Design a protein around this nucleic acid. Structure first.
Ligand SMILES: [Mg+2]
Ligand SMILES: [Mg+2]
Ligand SMILES: [Mg+2]
Ligand SMILES: [Mg+2]
Ligand SMILES: [Mg+2]
Ligand SMILES: [Mg+2]
Ligand SMILES: [Mg+2]
Ligand SMILES: [Mg+2]
Ligand SMILES: [Mg+2]
Ligand SMILES: [Mg+2]
Ligand SMILES: [Mg+2]
Ligand SMILES: [Mg+2]
Ligand SMILES: [Mg+2]
Ligand SMILES: [Mg+2]
Ligand SMILES: [Mg+2]
Ligand SMILES: [Mg+2]
Ligand SMILES: [Mg+2]
Ligand SMILES: [Mg+2]
Ligand SMILES: [Mg+2]
Ligand SMILES: [Mg+2]
Ligand SMILES: [Mg+2]
Ligand SMILES: [Mg+2]
Ligand SMILES: [Mg+2]
Ligand SMILES: [Mg+2]
Ligand SMILES: [Mg+2]
Ligand SMILES: [Mg+2]
Ligand SMILES: [Mg+2]
Ligand SMILES: [Mg+2]
Ligand SMILES: [Mg+2]
Ligand SMILES: [Mg+2]
Ligand SMILES: [Mg+2]
Lengths: 208, 174, 38, 141
RNA sequence: GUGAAGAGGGAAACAACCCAGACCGCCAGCUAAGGUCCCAAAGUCAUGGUUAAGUGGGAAACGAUGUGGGAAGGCCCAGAC
RNA sequence: CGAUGUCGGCUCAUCACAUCCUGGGGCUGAAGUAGGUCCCAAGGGUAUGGCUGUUCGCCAUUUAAAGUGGUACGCGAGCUG
RNA sequence: UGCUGAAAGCAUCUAAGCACGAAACUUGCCCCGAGAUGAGUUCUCCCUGACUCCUUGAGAGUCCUGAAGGAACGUUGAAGA
């Protein structure tokens, strides 16, 4: 199905033969199933999960009730995952990281690091204009943004300046190195989105 | 016009049933069904059949004379059965039938398997010749043409999958 | 095949056909004579 | 004296059901657009939505003459740089069978707020079943 | 001839094309061009045919058992294609 | 004409298909390798340098390819001059 | 590219019917996305007191009550003009 997990930086694993492989450390505490959405009620089969811990006061009655229906502790945040037809889960069921002990490649999905208002040079990899050779007040600017009296306008989906990052992105088919059961870890190869402490929807790789 | 104006015989032990326009013919080899064109009309004349073109429609004769030629083949099929005789001309070519799945070796990197839709009796008298029998000319002729499509005759040595009766032009190398 | 706008019979065995609106020619003997359109 | 203009509050509307199985799209969608507008009623006014509510059901079973099952294209722009999406009458029926009747009516209705108001009247369905038994909608032909 | 110096209806929009010359009023009727399934006023009007190409709703030389019409001559019961 | 800044370069593009590459095909004076021409195909991709203000061109060396055009011979309230 | 097949006692990929067939097309992959006014769904949470006036009206006020929640303010952030 999939598990929610907090990102805990990057390290590396020196494999016994020689190779040093860079790994992201994802702590994946027991994902507790709160709500089993079904075709009968909702019109689609899925499960709603949570993890971590809130304080018994920062949480609001609307959600403090919502958990009491299920009979679990109030985990920080809530996420929803799709079932695969043959699968079936129960309310108030913990999901450990042992799902990924079988599978090899995984997709990690998290919110990227916010860069704020980025220019076209940074955001869209626009080439910078000549730093000298007569140039006046236009080094890192975007140049032209259209044609002339024909369209008489700027087309939609034009690559201009604006917000960069702080957006949900998926990095696909990362190889799992180790799946630790004792400390509830998951060691995926390479780098995944979002800074240390950001949440990550980890799930089995779709591209089989 | 001429083909349509010629009654179709029905041998003994060949049960024909007319469900409106849907014709179901049951014989010894296998039961067969045929949904026919709306412009054609068909009835039983004692033993033989009759194919009348319906009044009101433009191309009745054309559509009836088709159905005549269909049921002519379909009645022959269920009683007698149809056959096609393929040969694999060329060195290093091989054919086999394990059950109802034709395993070919036509000089490729991988052996190709070919499935047989419906009751198509695929035989193998020799290892480089595929005889195959059944009821429908349609499906037989199709399957044969698929088995051909993997390798059409090279117009030089005649290398490939060919029919028995099919003459081929082998042009000279220049 | 040839897609000329004025297709026509080049030998005895050649024959004219109308497949999907388009006028074509097909031959028993020479594949060269096979032509389309017009 | 003046002529009687219709007054919304007093407009006693009616509900209808239309089985669209084996109907010609245009010939249907016209007869809908006549009713939706309210020109069949004798107290018709060109600035008031007098026309009735119609429930068209079995939208996917609608018929079209000639080769328009394949050849009838439905072009629509995306408001984007060069995105001109198209779809054949098959492909439209496979995807969204409601859209077919809805467009053919929407084209025939007038443009403007009243035009959009008298489209809201129309209710299109793919299946034979509908969930408006509370209104007792009469069978229209 | 029209516009310029002439409004109005039609030709989607369109000075000069078609119809027709605005004294003012009227919640009267009859007509012109053009129209009459819906946008949008009026024929899903009647009679007998043509087209299947979305032709209608841009176009040529030229191409073709596409299809609908009359008129003559070629061959049969010694039985033709 | 009570001003619509004209070549070329840079930046940024976008569309067309009369396709340069890649993809799918027929015929070949197609043995195979590689081609030749024609048909379908616009998803993506489509040099760096030397000379000259150049566009272009020639040359050198690459490339799977170094497409032809439209866009005020795209783009000066974006830069250069 | 084919497979059966009349009109045309044959032949033909097609006129009925049936099968393959490309980076194009529609999905699959990823992102925004119910202002999708057609404003969708599921789950949970929160509120159950009197009274005259009267063009007795989705009427208006008088006191009594103000929850869920939210805002603000503060400390601030790998969030951010
Ligand atoms: Mg930031
Ligand atoms: Mg640069
Ligand atoms: Mg200066
Ligand atoms: Mg400077
Ligand atoms: Mg500036
Ligand atoms: Mg500036
Ligand atoms: Mg075809
Ligand atoms: Mg409109
Ligand atoms: Mg003057
Ligand atoms: Mg008028
Ligand atoms: Mg007008
Ligand atoms: Mg003019
Ligand atoms: Mg004139
Ligand atoms: Mg006239
Ligand atoms: Mg009109
Ligand atoms: Mg209007
Ligand atoms: Mg009318
Ligand atoms: Mg001026
Ligand atoms: Mg220039
Ligand atoms: Mg082309
Ligand atoms: Mg695609
Ligand atoms: Mg150069
Ligand atoms: Mg200009
Ligand atoms: Mg020009
Ligand atoms: Mg210019
Ligand atoms: Mg310029
Ligand atoms: Mg400018
Ligand atoms: Mg100078
Ligand atoms: Mg200078
Ligand atoms: Mg035949
Ligand atoms: Mg690819």
């Amino acid at each position: 199905i999939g598990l929610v997990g907090k990102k805990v930086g990057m390290t590396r694993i020196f494999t016994e033969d020689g190779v040093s492989i860079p790994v992201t450390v994802i702590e994946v505490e027991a994902n507790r199933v709160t709500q089993v959405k079904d075709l009968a009620n909702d019109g689609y089969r899925a499960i709603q999960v949570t993890t971590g811990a809130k304080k018994a006061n920062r949480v609001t009655k609307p959600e403090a009730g919502h958990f009491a229906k299920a009979g679990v502790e109030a985990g920080r945040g809530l996420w929803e995952f799709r079932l695969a037809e043959g699968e079936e889960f129960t309310v108030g069921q913990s999901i450990s990281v042992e799902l990924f002990a079988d599978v090899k490649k995984v997709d990690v999905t998290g919110t990227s690091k916010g860069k704020g208002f980025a220019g076209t040079v940074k955001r869209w990899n626009f080439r910078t204009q000549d730093a000298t050779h007569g140039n006046s007040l236009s080094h890192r600017v975007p140049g032209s943004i259209g044609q002339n009296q024909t369209p008489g306008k700027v087309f939609k989906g034009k690559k201009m300046a604006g917000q960069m990052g702080n957006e949900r992105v998926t990095v696909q088919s990362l190889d799992v190195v180790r799946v630790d059961a004792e400390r509830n870890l998951l060691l995926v190869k390479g780098a995944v989105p979002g800074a240390t402490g950001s949440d990550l929807i980890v799930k089995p790789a779709v591209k089989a | 016009s001429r083909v349509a104006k010629a009654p179709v015989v029905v041998p003994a032990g060949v049960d024909v049933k007319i469900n409106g326009q849907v014709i179901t013919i049951k014989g010894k080899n296998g039961e067969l069904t045929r949904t026919l064109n709306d412009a054609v009309e068909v009835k039983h004349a004692d033993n033989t059949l009759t194919f009348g073109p319906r009044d009101g429609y433009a191309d009745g004769w054309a559509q009836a004379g088709t159905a005549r030629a269909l049921l002519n083949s379909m009645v022959i099929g269920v009683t007698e059965g149809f056959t096609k005789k393929l040969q694999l001309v060329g060195v290093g070519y091989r054919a086999a039938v394990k059950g109802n799945v034709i395993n070919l070796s036509l000089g490729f990197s991988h052996p190709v398997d070919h499935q047989l839709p419906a009751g198509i009796t695929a035989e193998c008298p020799t290892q480089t010749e595929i005889v195959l029998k059944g009821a429908d000319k349609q499906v037989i002729g199709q399957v044969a043409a698929d088995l051909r499509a993997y390798r059409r005759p090279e117009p030089y040595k005649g290398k490939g999958v060919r029919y028995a009766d099919e003459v081929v032009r082998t042009k000279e190398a220049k | 095949m040839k897609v000329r706008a004025s297709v026509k019979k080049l030998c005895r065995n050649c024959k004219i056909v109308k497949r999907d609106g388009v006028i074509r020619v097909i031959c028993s003997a020479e594949p060269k004579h096979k032509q389309r359109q017009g | 004296m003046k002529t009687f203009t219709a007054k919304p509050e007093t407009v006693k509307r009616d509900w209808y059901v239309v089985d669209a199985t084996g109907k010609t799209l245009g010939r249907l969608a016209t007869e809908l657009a006549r009713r939706l507008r309210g020109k069949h009623k004798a107290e018709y006014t060109p600035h008031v939505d007098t026309g009735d509510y119609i429930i068209v059901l079995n939208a996917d079973k609608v018929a079209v003459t000639g080769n328009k099952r394949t050849d009838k294209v439905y072009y629509h722009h995306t408001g984007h740089i060069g995105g001109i999406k198209q779809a054949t009458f098959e492909e439209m029926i496979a995807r969204r069978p409601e859209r077919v009747i809805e467009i053919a009516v929407k084209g025939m209705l007038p443009k403007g707020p009243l035009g959009r108001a008298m489209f809201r009247k129309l209710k299109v369905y793919a299946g034979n079943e509908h969930n408006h038994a509370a209104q007792q909608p009469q069978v229209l032909d």
